[PDB]
Design a protein around this ligand. Sequence first.
Ligand SMILES: Nc1nc2c(ncn2[C@@H]2O[C@H](COP(=O)(O)OP(=O)(O)O)[C@@H](O)[C@H]2O)c(=O)[nH]1
Ligand SMILES: Nc1nc2c(ncn2[C@@H]2O[C@H](COP(=O)(O)OP(=O)(O)O)[C@@H](O)[C@H]2O)c(=O)[nH]1
Ligand code: ALF
Ligand code: ALF
Ligand SMILES: [Mg+2]
Ligand SMILES: [Mg+2]
Lengths: 417, 417
Amino acid sequence: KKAGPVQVLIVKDDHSFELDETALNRILLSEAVRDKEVVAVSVAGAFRKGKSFLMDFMLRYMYNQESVDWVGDYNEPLTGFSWRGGSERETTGIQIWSEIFLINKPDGKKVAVLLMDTQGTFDSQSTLRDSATVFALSTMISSIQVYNLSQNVQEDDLQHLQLFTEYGRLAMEETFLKPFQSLIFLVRDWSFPYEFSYGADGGAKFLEKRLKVSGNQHEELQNVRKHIHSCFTNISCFLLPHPGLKVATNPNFDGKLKEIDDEFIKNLKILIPWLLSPESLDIKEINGNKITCRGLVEYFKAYIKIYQGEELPHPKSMLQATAEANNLAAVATAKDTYNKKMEEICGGDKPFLAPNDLQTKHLQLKEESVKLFRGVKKMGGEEFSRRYLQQLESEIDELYIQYIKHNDSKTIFHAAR
Amino acid sequence: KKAGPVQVLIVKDDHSFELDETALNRILLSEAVRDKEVVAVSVAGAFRKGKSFLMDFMLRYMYNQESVDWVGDYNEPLTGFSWRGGSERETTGIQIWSEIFLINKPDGKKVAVLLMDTQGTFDSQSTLRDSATVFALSTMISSIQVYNLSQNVQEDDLQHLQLFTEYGRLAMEETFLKPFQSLIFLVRDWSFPYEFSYGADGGAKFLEKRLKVSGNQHEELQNVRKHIHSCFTNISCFLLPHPGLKVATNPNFDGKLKEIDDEFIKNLKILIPWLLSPESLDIKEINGNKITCRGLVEYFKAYIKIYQGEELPHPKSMLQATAEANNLAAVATAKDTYNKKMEEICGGDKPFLAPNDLQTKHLQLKEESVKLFRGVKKMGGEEFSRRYLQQLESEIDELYIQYIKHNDSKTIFHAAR
Ligand SMILES: Nc1nc2c(ncn2[C@@H]2O[C@H](COP(=O)(O)OP(=O)(O)O)[C@@H](O)[C@H]2O)c(=O)[nH]1
Ligand SMILES: Nc1nc2c(ncn2[C@@H]2O[C@H](COP(=O)(O)OP(=O)(O)O)[C@@H](O)[C@H]2O)c(=O)[nH]1
Ligand code: ALF
Ligand code: ALF
Ligand SMILES: [Mg+2]
Ligand SMILES: [Mg+2]
């Protein structure tokens, strides 16, 4: 048929995930490609940043690799994966190109090349779990992940990457090898060529400075960086110029090269082959073993099941995760404080205490623990704390009841007039 | 001679905070302004996005408000707060303009106007606590907070804003009133005037869609929005055009209007008075009471002390907070499970168990609890879990010791040949 985009991972309105297995099998399990070792290319990152648009230039290269003018006719619209302006997301879930490219590597290996376009993270219809699942799955599956960013590499960008890739790691078999392979920090609309040049060399210098870990660097800064180094075998950076305001703002813009700034085009022609030339095609490795298209379908199915289940922790926002953490820790301290004090009163090495006195002491101790809990400043504040405080009181009462039984076993009664 | 930027909040290299009290007092405690009700304007948001640049135009408006041509001579460079290109942060901590502007409000009140320029969030030398502190403090002190965004309002931006404002709330007196007043979402380089027009009306429609809370919207989406509605009295949005590639890109660019796109200038001229015209100047209110410059210095000192201490919870990244949350919860379940099983064996209502048998049962139960803990998938893995597992085992052992004493108190010994 006509080659086209195929929706492979579907994100439902209830935030669940479906894999189109029939469609996936039709593409990767064909007699022509199934036994071929696979190269998987993905682009991922914040929504509305020209991921699909870039991927469509990648397509022109994959088809027209032989011509020096692979970049295309200057009056020809850009087609393939769906891309457009407007502030609302276009690409959802994960889609792959229906035509698998067969390329000869400089070592004589004929390999299969798969292209993946992904739903941008942090759009306004998505839970953090949605964004994390999409990003993770694309990372786990691709051998080359193009991490698409706007203008700069900010600390929050590194943190998002850490979280999303951590979510991918959780769903994977444990290994001594790094989980993933090639990672590319593609910086769109890089504005400072006078400081770091456009392209890969300026990019590399820019990334080495930004990902640098040093002795006097605060641990929080060190850790997010070390995490990224530990995840990927090869990490690079490419600085791309702004493509011009027509591309950005013009509702009629169709993707014709005649409308794009020449400096952008010059760098794009460097970028794509740098990604996709035969010598650059990273064959997918899982657990240090090269994977075929057939094998990739089997891992895709297995990973998706894990994300469909409930074994993994839910990805959470900073506020939500910190508030929970603050409350859980405070409950533990408060309860433990109660336990220690009751031990001094009716531990096994302590005498029988009259039940009315034991009750008075318990009410006092419980109250001290509640005040202790109330007094700790936590995010989410008191409202968020409510179920935790009630949990604290409910758990202290369970302990008290256990203590009542211990104390009663020492009961002394003397009859006296 | 005279006026210039003054560093008021200093962030040290060890990530501690110092207030320049002498400098603050010299400006806000002067006889001319100390007893005046105060309007405090702040710009805050991601680093390297033109906050200081914008603020310098605010300065032009503040000085030249009377002239219709306040925006300035087209050949005049932009000065005041320090602004520049390059990928490394410029503004650190918080600085204020040395000259407090005295303006008559249309109701006859003469008020004092203060401008605050802030260190951008998420730079590569800052902990999350550094950024949260800067953002929170600027929000707590300002009556008008300009939230500076690039291109769009993404879900992560709303999450950052929720966290930072929560960090501010934690340091403030309990109140029934909303903690803050005016918040402005200023979107720089808005790319879709064909969808939502440049300026406040387009901004307003875009923001009402983006901050909208509905019945069928996932709770995670609802909650970050409700939090924002709850924090601020008046929330608005302004969509600003790209100022042109020269402004973004030219190392020689000086802030001269002749180098700036006319549509940007057209919109800038609307934006500033919309923020700062006499009718718009929001008097700072804390706990529903209007504040003078004298009072503002006092709240500034009081809030900063809280951030210098350790009563507040530490802001943490998604991974760090979620990983801690996962581990704390798993320890409580695992420990609670051990406790319940031991109760069935040596609760107060249970007969004496020979210590060798009690020991065997304890080792079995502890082991079941450890496996339960190890079986729960957590961010990020065993590495992060190590201290928690050790805490779990160590806490179970404490419990066991309490049970040994309970059991010994029921000891039965019979002498027999
Ligand atoms: N500012 C800017 N806009 C771009 C660039 N590349 C593409 N665009 C525009 O970005 C918008 C969104 O493109 P799209 O590929 O659908 O974004 P996606 O959501 O990441 O897949 C379109 O209007 C493109 O014309 C770029 O490098 N810089
Ligand atoms: N793309 C873009 N660049 C801007 C805008 N305003 C200022 N700039 C440029 O942004 C850079 C950083 O300016 P600065 O005010 O120091 O950023 P800040 O660190 O957020 O305070 C300078 O190169 C300005 O020329 C804008 O609206 N859009
Ligand atoms: F906003 Al998108 F693909 F990330 F349309
Ligand atoms: F990067 Al800035 F003020 F945010 F210099
Ligand atoms: Mg897309
Ligand atoms: Mg600045």
